[PDB]
Structures are given as C-alpha cells and as structure tokens.
C-alpha cells in the first residue's frame, strides 16, 4: 500500500485512486520500460569520470541500488561536467551529497518520476503531494466540452 | 496432548495462524477433511485461524463461553479417534 | 395488536397443523405449460393458487366463486398472496436429527442425555449401536455397543434387550428418559455428594433439565419426524427473460430431501438388505442437515454453480440473513438524493428543494390537494395534470410544501445530528441547497457530498420532525452543551476582518452617536471598517429578576465593532464584541447568548452573524496572492548553520566519537531545532509586519497579510501549514515512523525539486491510506457501543437516592487540567453543599446545577460535590431523570423517555472519529504557586535532622489557598525529605520535599541503637565492603543468592534504645524491627545508634496512549498482565514462603479471619514493608491496575471514576470534548451482572451470574418480606461480553450468532417480551424510547388491568 | 472536510510523534560519568562534550545498539 | 511477486518479547516452496511446503552432509592447544573485537589488557601491531565451548567426545590422555557470529542421511510405510527434477542476484550450493550483516 525508494522513475508516486485501493493501482511513470524479464526499468544518462554522456542506459530496480545516480536538476557546464563539486545523488535509497568523481548515472529528464496524468499539471512542485494525487485523479474524469480550448 | 496446549497458545496469543495449527496437529492425520473439521472446531470457540501474522494492531470476544470447554473436549477427543463419521460416501 | 413472542420446539403435530397438505413429489413446474405441477414443491392445491381468484383448472375465473375449491383440480379460489403463507409438511420415512440441537456446541441432545457428542454421532451415522432399556440383564440404559458385541449379547438374549441405532435410537432414548426422574436424581446425588467440577457440571445439567421441564417442550422433539417446507413465494422460481428461470437454492435442497425420502420409502417397501437402506438413511440425513444448516458439519453440498448453496439458517443467520440487512436497513419510499450546494440566503430552519424533487416526492399530497380544490375531477385527471406540470400544479405544490418539514440525512450518520429536518423552500434547480451553519453538524461540504431527503407522511411524524428534529431545535452538540452552530470559514474571516483596527485608517478618532451612525459613515465611505472611534452604545443586562436594565456609555471601539453591534440581541455586554473575534470568540459569543437569552434569540442571532459575516467578508475582498507567502530573510542563515551542525556531527562520526544511531539522532535533533527556528522567524516576520504611522513616525500593528488573517482568525490554517508555505517544510517521515534524515528545506512557495517531492510522497500516501481505511471502519465503535447500551431509557422522574460520586477538579502532574465548573455542570447534586465554615445549607440536595449555580459554586470556592450518577442510580430497567442530569442537547432536563443509551454511544462514537485510528504514545518537590500545605495519607517521622520522612505510602501533597480550594497536586515519595511539616505556611520558592531517587528509606521512628536481629551474615547477609569509602556494609541479599541457613529467615534491622532492650514501635506488640528485603543498602552496621528515621537500610531503584483503539480496549476491560496487586483486606501485613516465583503474602485482621494468602510472582519488585498493617484496596505491585480489581476492592464508584478518567484523558489529549454522563451510562451498562456472596434466602445458585437488577429487586422484595435476601458480589464485563448476555432473543439474535441463540431460546421455551429497541424495530412496532414511550406505558397498563 | 485535509493531519501526527521519540533519545541533562557503565572504559572528553550526560563509551553503545536492532 | 528467494523478518509481532524471526522463503515458478524460519529461541527450522516445521540441519543431512563438515561450513574455527600448561589458545586479534576478556590478555610476557576489560579497538591495534600469535588464558575459557568434529580413542576406539559437544574439564582431561593437541572449538559470539546452527544441531533428532529422509517422508505424506530409496526418490525429486520443480530463468536471475552470485543464469533445479548459500545468507542476516527484503521493493 505504500511507496518505496525504488519507485523512482518506475511508478508514479502521486497518481493513484484515492479511496478503497490506494497504492494497489499505482500507475506507470513516463519513461518506464519493462525489462527483458518483466521487471520495470528506467533510463539514466551514463556519466563517465566527470562528463555526462548522452548515451542512455536502462537500469532496472535490482541494479539501481548499487550505483550513485545523479539528480535530474544538476547543472552542467556545456560539456557534461557538474559545475558543483559535490552533487545531489541517491546511492542506496537514502539520497545524499556525493563528490564530483563518484556519480555513476544521471536522470534522463525531470519529468521521469511522474506519470502522464501527473505531468500535465503545471507547478506540480508547488502542491501538497495528496493534492496532486487528487488533481491527477480528477483530471482523469474531465468531460469533453463543446469547444475544446 | 500438543493440541490442548495449541489451544492455550492460540488463546494467549489471541490468534492462530495456519503455521501453528499445522505444527501442533496430530502427526497422523492424512485425510485433510479432518484438518478442516478440527480447525473449524477451533475457530468456533476462538481463536480464528487466519493464515498469516495479522491481528497485530487490531484490538477488535464473541467466543463465550460454554462452547469453549465443550469444543476443547471435542478437540481432545478427535485424537482419541481417527475419524470420520462425516462423509456418507466413505462410510 | 399482539404482545410477547414465544419460540420453542415444534411437535410433528403442530407441524402438521401448520401445513395445508403434504408434498410428495420433487417436481416443480411443467416445463412447457409452466403451471405449477401437482403435487410437488410448487403445488397449486397445497400452497394456494397462482392467480388472484382463479383456480388452476381454468374453470373458475370469477370472484363469484371466491372460496370454492375446484372439484377438478382441488385448488382454492383465493388470492395469490396466500401463496406466501401456506406451508407443507414432508412425511419423513425415518426420523432425523435436527442438526441445530445436534451440533450447536454444546450439543443439546448431548447434554440433555449426558452422552458424549462422539457417541451420538456414532449412533446417528450407524457406526454403532445404543441400548434403550436393555432388559433386566446386563447393560445400563445409555450403554453404547457395536455390531460385534450386539450380535454377541443377542445370543444371550433375544428379548429383554433393546439396542437400536440411528435416529430411531436417539428418539426412543429422548422419549424414554424422564426429566423429573433424572433431575431429582441429580438433585439427590448432588446434595448428599458435592465436588467442585462435579457440582459445577451437575448443577448446570439440572438447570438445563428443569428448564426443559418448565418449558412446554418434549425431550424428543429435537428429532424431526415431519418436516415443514417454506411457502413457494418465499422460495420462488421466477421466470427471467429468455425462458431462463431463476430460483433460490431451497428448491434444490427440497428436491434433494424429497428424492431421498421417497427412495427410502420405496426401499422400506421392497424390504432391502439393511446395508443399502442404511446408506439411504444416512443420505437422507445429510440432505435434511444440508437443508437446515448447509456447511454446518459435512463440507456443504455445492449447487450447480460450484457454490455452497444457502439454507434456512443462511437466510436467517449471519451478515446476510434476514436479521441483518432487510430487517434493520431497507430501501424506503418517498425519498430522494442529490447534490447539496450552499444557499446562504436561507434561514437555518429551511432547505432548498428542487421543484423536480419536490413534485416527485410529494405526489399523493398534490393529487389529494388537486382533487380537493376541484382543480381536477378524478385522481387520474390529477395524475395527468401533474405529469403535464401545469401552472397551477406548481402553486398547489407550494401550498402542500408549506409546513411539511422534510428530513435531510447524510451518508455516514455518525451521530444524531446527521438527521435533521427543515422546511422546504422550493428551489428552481437540481441541488439541495443546504444552509451553511448546518454543515458542521452534517459534517458536510460542497465538493460533491450527496444528501438524501425523506418525507414524513403522518401527522405524528411531522410533529416529531418539527418538535424533535428541526434544525432550529438542535443548536447544541449532544456530546456537550457547547453549540454545533459555530460559524466556519467565510464568516469568521469576514467577522474578523470587520472587528479589527488599523493604527491610522480613514475617519479615525471621530465620535459617533451610535451604531447607526457607524454604518451611515461606513457605507457612505467616510470611515474605514476598522478605524478606532468613540461611539455611544447602550448595552442591556438582565441583572434584576427578568428586568433587562439598560446602561449607556461612550465606548472606545472601532467602526466595525459598532456596526456589528446592531445584530447582537439585548442582554449581551459590549465586551463580547470589543475583542478581535476569531473563531473561539465568535463561538463563545453564541454560547453566552444561549446561556442568557435562551434559544430563539440564539438562532436568530446566529443567522445574523452568518449574514453579516458573509457580507463583510465579501466587502473585504480578502484574496490570497503568491506575494502573501512571505519567506523570512533569516532563513538561509538558519539553514546554513544547521547544515554546519550536521557537517560537524558527521565529521565527529567519521572520527569515531559517536555511534551511527547517535549521529542520526543528533542530525534529526538539529534539523528539528532549525525547523522550529525558521517557523519562528517567519511568524515574527509575518504577524506584525504591517508597520504603519499615525500623526507622525511609525508603529507596528498586527499584520494584514491575508494568509495571516485567515490563519489568525481561526478561519482556516494554523502555524504549521504556513510553516510549510513560508518556512521550511521540515522532516518528512516514512510510513514506518522512522524519520528520513535529510529534510525538505524548502516550501511550496519555492518549489520542491524531484527528490524532496519524492520524499514527501511517502508520508503523504501513508496518511491518505489511513484515512481511506479510517472511514470504512467508521461506526465500529459507535455500533459496538449501542449494542451494549441500546435498551436503556430515562424511565423515571426520580429514584430518590443519596448515592452519587464526588466530582472534583482534575489536577494531574502540575496544575488543573479542567475546572469543576465543567465536570459538575447540569448534574444533580446528591447531598447538600455546605459552605467552607459550613455556615448554612447553601445548595439544596436536588438542584439542577445550571450556570447560575456553577457561578454560585465557584463564588464559594468548592472543589468536591456529591453529584448523582447514572451508574449509581436505583431504578430498575432505566434511569431516573434526576440521577442522570440534563439533556445537554436540549438544555432543560432529561425527559421521561430519552433513549440516553443510544445517544451516549453516539456521543462517544462521533468524537471517536476525531481521534487517530492507529494507537499512539508519548528533581525535588519545589513549590511554584502561592498557597498552603496539605499532606494526605501521611504517617511520617520527624528525624533528628528536623526534616520529615513519611513512613506511609499514599502520602501526597496538595496546595490549598486562602479560599480552601485545591490549587496543585504533587506526590510525596517515601522518605521524601520534607523541609516543611504539614499544613503550615508556604510560599513559592521553598522546595517542600527534597528526596534522592537512588535511595528509598527504611526510616525508623526512633533515634535508637541499631540492631541486627535475625540477620545471619553469610546465610541472610552479604559481606559487602565498598573500598572507595571503605564501607562496612552487611547488606542483605534477596532469596535468590544466599544458602538455606537463613533462607526464609528475616534480616531484621531494628532500632532498640541505648541500653539494649528493643524499642517497641508505638501502637502494637512489635518493636521496630524492620525486616529487611534483599538488595538493601544497609550502610550502618550494628553498634551505632542513630536518628529517628535515618536511612539505615536504603532500598535501591507517565506514558499515555491515545488511539481510539485505546478507547476500545479501555471499554473491553482486559486484565493487563502487569497488574498492581491490591490488598484483599486491611490489617497487619506479613510475608511467608519464598522462592517459588509465587511467594506468599498474607494479611491478618485484628478481628476477622486472617489466613488470606496471595502468591506474588517474584518478577515484580515488592512495594510494602514486611510488617506494615496495610489498608484495604492498596497496591503492592505497581503499574496497570485491572479495573476488575478496582471494582472488587474500592467499589463501584472507584471503577467508574477510573474508567471515566481513562477515557476522558484519551479524549482530552487531543482536545476532544465529551461529557461524563456518556461514559458513565456505558460503564453502568458494563457492570450489570452480579454474583452472590451468599446464596441467601433467594432462589439463586451460589456462583450463578444474574443481572444485578434481578438480585436487587428480589432482595428488596425479600427484606420487605420476612427473610433477608442475597448477598451479591457486583461484577464487571466488557462491552463485548455484556452485550452478548441480554434478555430478549429477537434482539440478541439479530447481531449475535443466530443459531446458538435460537436453539437455546427454543429448548428453553423463552418467550420474548417486546420491551427493547432492537426487537420493536424488527417486529415493526413503536420503540419504547421516545414518543412511543407513552404508547408503551398505556398499553402496559391496558394489560395488567 | 476531505481526503487530503484529514490525510494532512494523519501525516502530521505521524511526523511529530516520530520526531519526538528520536529527539527524546537525545540526552539533554548534565551528569558527567567518565566511566562506561558496562565496561568501565573512560569516556573521552570529546564524546562527552557532544552529548552531555552520556553514560556509555562509543564501543559499548555500538554494541548495545547492534543488539537493539534485532529486538532482543 | 516474482519467483526467487526472499528474506523477511516478521518484525516483533509473534513473540511477546518483540524479538524478530527472519524467515527466508524460496518460491519457485513451479514446484515446491521451501521456508527457513528461526524460532524465538534462535533455532533454524526448515519447513518444506507449508506443512509442519522441521529442524534446520535435517535437510543438510539429507543432502549427504554430516555434523563435522556442517560445522565447518557454517562456522569459523578456534584452535586450542594443550601447550603443556592448561590449554593455551590460538589467537588473531580482530576476532576479539567486542570481547570481554575473562583473563589477562598478555603477550611478550606483557599484559595487553587487564582482565575484565571489554576488548577495545585500542587493544586490537596493540595485539596485531605487536602481532600476538598465540595467547594463554585460564581453562574455564574453554570450559564452555563446543568441539568442532569427532574425537575417538587410540586406546579402544572409543569416542573421546562426539562432534558438536559442549566442553567440560573432563573432556580436555580425556583429550590429554589421548595426547590431542588440537581442540577444535567454534568461534561463537553473541554479537556477530552467533551460535545458531550449533543449537539447531542440538535439537536435530536424526543423526544421518537415512534418518533425515525418514523424517522428511514422514512429514511429506504420513501414514504410508517409508523406504530407503523410496524416500531418496521423493527427496531428490522434490527440488532436483527438471520435470517437477523449476525456478524459471527470471527465478534463477533473482536467485543468483539475491545471493550475490557472479553468474546470472543457471539451472532450473536447486543444488547443495543453493540451499547452503540460502542458509548462510539467512544466518548472516540474523547476525547483522545484511538486511531483510522490502516486499514492495520493485
Ligand atoms: C495531530 C494531533 C491532532 C489531530 C487532530 C495532535 C493531538 C495530540 C498531539 C500529540 C500529543 O499532544 C502528545 C505529544 C505532545 C508533545 O508536546 C508534542 C508531540 C505529541 C506527540 C503531540 C503530536 C500531535 O500534535 C498530536 C498527535
Ligand atoms: Mg466531500
Ligand atoms: Zn380447478
Ligand atoms: Zn437515580
Ligand atoms: Zn563500553
């Protein structure tokens, strides 16, 4: 019934039907694919020693907990070098600060944590979580109008 | 009679799993229907044999009270027999 | 019409009278012409005809033959309603054991015969034999046998030997037994011989036997001979669409029974070998047993759908039987639902109602009125007129609607204000516009919540609704007299914005001729709504006897307050509106108006508050903008310093100066402190930040930041939510309760990035999940509590008693947690309240302590009143009005007829929804107030140090001031070194007790010689020597170390005097030889006399839960296994045998019988000295005290005070307000079973449990008679156990196990008298509670007359 | 009210009575002890400076917490 | 939920004390389950498909393992020597990291730690930087240990002391008469390397492979007479048949990943390697190096 620190980029953390079955009908995130086995995987930019390459790399859930993944909102100096020394990352569940030369992967784009429903909300980052949940659920019931605007 | 202290275990816990009621059974029951009937007799007096850990934080006692000693008698007796007297077909 | 309902066995004779002919064949219909086939499961001639007044022949199709039975095919020309009341019998070829009396646990054929269930189950399924009057040869009557021994003893005897098998045997047994015979034989051989389990079970059996004799039953009617069949229309075979019939399983089951019955009959005709007929009998028995209660014993027969098909019990018993859904909750006519909207234009006694809804719910009213006014000739013409909806139909509608109030109800009816009744204002629309103030009660809001309107038809119903349920009649929460009409959010913010004041607004300073001039300026535009001003207001007061005397003055107010003054009624001071009017002030305004001007002016005034509030919140234009969520500017500094803190702790961790858990704790600690600091920075920046200037420089006033206004008016919001808008939103928790170590240091005004948002998601979804579950399990507490307390009703005006309880201010830990004015308000005083010097009888002894009397109490500073309680009433089967109090939902007093049990359960289950669902947790005695000492339960010694060391146990210090009332509570620990004495003068700053928790004295009374009497060093002593001080300590050890040389000996540290004789302790024949427990810090070794109460021997060394489930357990009355062991009797304590775990402790009286032993498990640290003469109802083990013990020792009043305090504290830690009558009435419903201390002159078994009213009526009847009656012992059961044992069976079979209650009430011939509230709802008569109380009374005097 | 309005208070009680027990494990009193109450080692000055009133050396505290972690 | 091996805790909700139990299921895509449940007294109990619980090492014995190599698998060794004077011991200093010495830790003739001391990291560095390679302690330090393997007489072929034997003074007494110099006890600490399989041996009713298969068959389908190779057949088809039991390829991936196997794919049938790796990972989760699985973990 609840979210785990490996839902990141695989299952929407906010978009669920509130009511009787919360967290059982979790909806898929934007870039989430399924592994060759059946496991969900999400992309990550391969970041070698200090440069964030634009070759992407689909990590599954069992593997992502053995890498220092970057943060989607991490600046870059026109070449793929983080313009901070330390950089926000999430190594094993607990997020943290990690030095420049430790990140193993970066995130593909910042909408990769939320589902298609909860990505049409502007200013999602200024809302209570449950408010965005109710918001996605109620966007999913909108009746088409005469003149769609 | 490990059955008899199985009953007291299920009481002093307030619940029984299928694990416990598979542990403290008679080792000689092969006809599953006997297991069915006896777990029903257990639940009839308390305590209800759910299949897992829960009742952890559910503090709700409809199992009073004359049924308790009678059902304990029936359980203590089920070992004295081997069945079945419940299926007409097999009889 | 009728009266009590009798249930019992049914003979075969009575069953043959019930029927209208026997069903022989198993066929239902005729498959091509679907006439019900004769004469089977749907027989026209047995179970009535299929068409109204038409026989199945076709020959008789007119009413003119109504009543003749067609000679061609036998049917009786009648109504096919008759096809729902006839029954038919099935002649069983062999007898059959009724599975209910067979396998109910306890088996009634079993313990009516005293035969084990296994043996009857053997004889039934023919695996055995059983003798019945086995001649005068060898075998007792009940003797089982088998095939083998049977055929053997038959060689012995062909006659004088009767061993049957199967239901024939059990029947010949049941009939051959003699109830009077075995009952009196058990009498004899239980009288002349008594043994514990023997007398237990045998007197149980004789109870059952004489119950069977007292009833009209017969012992063998448990064994079916004729079987009845339900009427067809109750088990129909309805034709669905497409020639695909639908039936109920009962047709399949009846087919299965009739088939095997016929097959058995044919076998018996053929004279088959008894193997096959045995299998046939067993098959028929399984058929009947699956027809009666399928799934009971033998793996229920499954229908054609794979499914275990239902039987008669499953149509009765369980969650789905009759008793539960259609017998309690039904779909009801004249009813509709729709979406509620606001409609502020209303009064609070009306509700909008759409013309479509109104015209449709009110059809027969309009029809009758259109044909009464002549607007329509017939009723058919009236229907046509309405369905065309003509211009006069609407006017006739508005004529009908006028005074007919409609009931409005919402989905989760959590309490009795969930149903109210309004007058309908027709509303050209489609939404039920519900008045705003009422949404508090209904718990409603306008985001889609549907409400359901019901119409009351009769005149008694309209008068109930208009007199008992109108929305203007319930402005007080029935949980507590505080009103439920408090304005919520638009209106408190409008009222707040009005009654405020800038520091320099328009039109400031000017003085006004009154409030009318205030509005004449404001609307004109010459004064801001809050610009301070002097205005002349004339406020009234009801100081005299109903004389509202005016007093005028020039008050210093604002334009807003004076404009709002025009809506306040007369008798209210201007001080009520000269404040800033948040939500609390705007609630207590309504509250004072109720306490002064009664109810009508309060409803009018509340409507006026709402109108003026909406109007001036509209005029305020008070929006919210993103520029209003002002971040502080010292935020980045606070966050930076907290980050430096966590970096330094992490650095210390990297240098091995801390564990992991402690680095984590310090991180969470510094983050909590930084979060609090940012909250404070923002609130300081935001509350006063309006900085204005008048005739000069500058001056900071409270802010007008609209977010702050809505948070500070109590309109919407608080410190925390703006902490999340402006400050940082703190530490977010994952759902286990373990807080994440990095906090979101941002707000919602600045975004959260992806990680911080993903972190808030955890706790957010946890909270969402726990409200989506907390709702679905909503009325479980209220429902569980009305099962126990439903049948309770205020049934007498006064019971004339002087019992009661001593209501007192609650003072726990420090100071008062609630005054006496609350806990006494509107309860009847039991005995006279005298003044402090007692001076006269001040408060008479039957005075309804309303607000004047609460004032007149606190104006003499009383802190203890003997108030009548519900639980200590005297009336049987009810409660007298006075010993309950006043109906806090109506104000005046309880009436004869209020079903206070239901409203108590509701008043505890409603506020139970504001308590969290999952459960929940949490040096010296320095004076801090001005007052004077008072030590309670004190027995001390003033040692040579001049200090005080109290030798008692229950000694604690309370603070009593100039008036006498208790000021503060504190406990005085044992040997708490008191610098003061007792009762003398004190001030705040002189620590009254200094005591060291390291040591618990053995304080002597005498400054005498030490003496180690009975102290064997090495066998009763341990040779301790602390070489720090070099301390010669002959310490005493427990009974867990030393040898058997002094094992149960007693190390006695005694103070004798300075010549060598033992100093007797003053009062008894024991010198002061304090026998030593183990582990004692007995520093001083012998030969050193010391002060009167030094620590010669020194003993070595408030969590509260809060869930609603803590309430459920508080009521279930469970014995926590860490229970304080009270003292079964006052008197000299003493120990005994040791080292069993169960160690002996016994208390001897001066007078009574001494020997009472109790085995204290040695896991618990004992807490009473060896030779202290102990009180009654003391404590030895300390911790949880089981309430059962509190009852059995301290009495009823002590257990009620305990449970009331437990529940009240669980509700008070969140601030939920609930009265005491409710917990008291539920507690009275808890202790309503008693058992007798002496069987006495009455007709009661010794250890039998009977309802306390039964004992107390019989004993009153007996001591009014010659003898003296039973000496009872009150008992206490939980709600879940007390609501099981109840008197009716129609009631207690609705919600209990149906089969067990029905079988017991059947065997016992228990005729139910409809005098409860569940029964009279099931049967469908008037409840005895409310309006129906009068009818039930006058019908109770019709009979008995 | 609504789903989110009560869910807020459920989460808020959760967070508050989760902060408070982690913050109550913190020692705020003052009584220097100088000797780990299990092993008698001298608690160094610095590890007594961070948490005043700490009555265990870091080694014994790590042991006791490792033991706590399995609920023994 | 995918096939594979899962480790869960059942945290503080069955026992009264609150101690957690740390079971370790093995669910295959098709076949028979296998569960490994501790008990409140820290006893490994393997229960094949959900019926009655059995002691742990009975399945190991059915794998044709006996007690000595079982202890060699599930433990480290400690080697006491009769150094001509009251049984002095082999020592490596990092083992002791968390000890409370019942003696005077001394080498070079030099007391490293006074007796009674909770063994410190300080004395750790002292030992190895000074490299203590054999210590001497009193005899009641070996008085309560357990012997690793078998021990039988050179006199009459009689048992010195059985494998997995609690120690005493007479046991070392008879070892001296046997001339034994290698006391193989185990390294069991309350904190990290706890004794669990040892006590589970103590509770094991059976002693050899045939007894184990007898017990297993009596549990699987009771009533029928057992038989040596009949029980052998039942067991070796229960989790070793290509026909019956199979963790599919995803099951094998989850398995070889949940134990940190270098490979990623293999058989569809279990092995001694697999069940022993499972038991090891379980007891090392109990020790405190590892973590139970979150169920919702995607
Ligand atoms: C959220 C909830 C209101 C729900 C409506 C309120 C009502 C009672 C509050 C707790 C208790 O006071 C005990 C304790 C007091 C401490 O001082 C601060 C923390 C504690 C845990 C409080 C947290 C929270 O504030 C509670 C749960
Ligand atoms: Mg709503
Ligand atoms: Zn006819
Ligand atoms: Zn009364
Ligand atoms: Zn230590």
TrEMBL record, chain B:
Annotated compartments: Cytoplasm
Domain of life per record: Bacteria
Signal peptide: none
Similarity-based family: Belongs to the sigma-70 factor family. RpoD/SigA subfamily.
Subunit (UniProt): Interacts transiently with the RNA polymerase catalytic core.
Function: Sigma factors are initiation factors that promote the attachment of RNA polymerase to specific initiation sites and are then released. This sigma factor is the primary sigma factor during exponential growth.
Name the UniProt record assigns to this protein: RNA polymerase sigma factor RpoD
Section covered of the full-length record: 7 to 100 of 613
